[PDB]
Symmetry: C3
Subunit: 256 residues, 3 copies
């Protein structure tokens, strides 16, 4: 009914709880994940450090880590405030920032890839071009400081020190110790041929890690149509780029 399991990554990789995992994937498309290299500690360390910067970083040094266009892709954004990162072109205040945040990013990127790898394994999915080339992709990490959507990611990881639709009701998703919250996104549904649900969710700090596909991730157009994707795509295969266009879009509303 409206419950959300915890899975241990380690157990999934050993091949335990495979029916339960497949059933969670198909019916809910969200779960908590443990034993994935993330603690709860390290969050603290990255959090306090960037929070000090938000609170006590000088306006002059905020400038040095602000992109010239206000996209929230890298560095600082003031609207509430955000700090964003990916695998390259980062903007680090540094001294020690780069160290703590490169580590926090990398562990989340490892955890995201390894859980996506298990989603693919559990569903018998081989992406066009292979699993590895699919998962060596374009992640985006956003950390922010102070309307229902689904994600266009493969998975999205959300760390806590939030509500989602489960079984037809929007439910709260409280903290579970040393567990991260995983939302499957629309690329999971797409890549698996419909075996994975992309749940709606929304709010009511935050750390959100999107495991986003490469521009050239390629999929079958008829199979996309079958899963519920309302594609306007001529011909039999397409890319991520063809579908979403030339700028990443991270989330989507159900049409009004």
């Amino acid at each position: 009914d409206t419950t959300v399991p915890t899975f241990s990554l380690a157990e999934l990789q050993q091949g335990l709880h495979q029916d339960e995992f497949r059933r969670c994937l198909r019916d809910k498309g969200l779960f908590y994940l443990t034993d994935c290299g993330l603690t709860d500690t390290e969050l603290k360390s990255a959090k306090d450090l960037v929070i000090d910067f938000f609170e006590h970083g000088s306006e002059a040094e905020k400038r040095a880590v602000t992109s010239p266009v206000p996209t929230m892709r890298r560095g600082f954004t003031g609207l509430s405030m955000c700090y964003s990162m990916g695998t390259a072109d980062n903007l680090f205040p540094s001294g020690d920032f780069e160290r703590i945040w490169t580590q926090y990013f990398d562990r989340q990127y490892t955890a995201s890839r390894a859980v996506a790898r298990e989603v693919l394994r559990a569903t018998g999915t081989e992406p066009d071009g292979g699993v590895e080339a699919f998962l060596d992709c374009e992640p985006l990490l956003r950390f922010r400081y102070f309307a229902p959507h689904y994600d266009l990611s493969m998975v999205t990881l959300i760390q806590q020190t939030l509500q989602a639709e489960v079984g037809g009701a929007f439910t709260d998703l409280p903290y579970r110790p040393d567990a991260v919250l995983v939302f499957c996104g629309a690329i999971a549904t797409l890549v698996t041929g419909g075996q994975v649900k992309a749940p709606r969710h929304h709010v009511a700090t935050s750390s959100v890690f999107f495991l986003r596909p490469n521009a050239d991730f390629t999929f079958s157009v008829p199979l996309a149509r079958e899963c519920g994707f309302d594609v306007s795509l001529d011909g039999e295969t397409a890319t991520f780029q063809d579908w979403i266009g030339g700028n990443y879009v991270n989330i989507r509303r159900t049409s009004k």
Copy 2:
């Protein structure tokens, strides 16, 4: 001034009221349509049946007709609730559902094509690739249960058991017996070289049938620019896909 005519499809096909029809097309881009194979009865039959499902369908069987991504393209969506259909990949609770709804869909798809065929005939329009290949397209039917936009369809049919702009005022569009409401959309304007208005409208159950072009519907870029389309398209011809991108977009707001 601010009146909306009824046309009989049958009369338009006989070549009656052709100046009146052309003038409605160009100045208003909306009308009621009779004698098009739709009753008022059959609405009831599809309505009551899906409404029973909305009201009394079990959460477990709603799951079997819910797409894994919440696009409202096929099957059930809960936000108020929706049931969607097209020509293929449907999700039917069935027993008799599939029968009543396949019929309700088909008659609306027939009525939409036949009225679009008369829009094209009245305006002297031959789409690139022919009329038939244009009208053998990608319709979408949405039925829902409990801000002004124009439609990006060829026509949109709306059945009643609503306000639009006519002559510079937003007016009510009450029911007329055994008539369906037709809104011309932006593909009508585009395909006809500007001979058809795409009116703005909005709300204040619902059945909406969008007659949407194929991804490969091809048109002239300079002629599009002339009709008011603010295209960013290099070269002399383009497709629907090139214009709108790789996911259908059904409605649009005037830029804020």
Copy 3:
């Protein structure tokens, strides 16, 4: 800190105040501009004339200058009301309208190109395909009569008879005599490799002139990524069209 300079175009072209201009570009991305062929008078003349049309133009003649799709690209739109223009396919009530407005448009298009030419010169930027082919582009003028965004233009010129972010605070931008307000847009940032800021701004009549790139404006994908553009573009170069798609988009919000 939070001040906005006036530059004289004439002085910039003579090579004066070049460090100050570069520093304004990089840190603020907005300024007032004088000595650019715009007065304050001519505004009046175009304003009063179109305002008379808004107030006293007959509904029948508003129809003759209304596009069949309500895009606000050319002619009249009623929502408050708008009058739009570009280099071709205009809709003029005329008698003398076309004269006053063709002049008001042309002087703004001259001023926009000449200031963009100085942005490019100041930053040592040679666009792929040359400066001239870049600036011979697709401008759009909107004049209207009675949420923070950045512009996707090269520059946007705004005439006054408004708030923006400067140094981390949203500030008012009062009138300065015989000066026009210039906002640099995201194409300035993109084309210059990040040397120009695209500031956020918003409201709280209006004349807005967008100097928009051609569909085929071509840029480097890795350099775009470096400047903060969250592109989903395979391969090493791309066009405006590839990035934004097949319909112009003039403004953008920072992701929510």
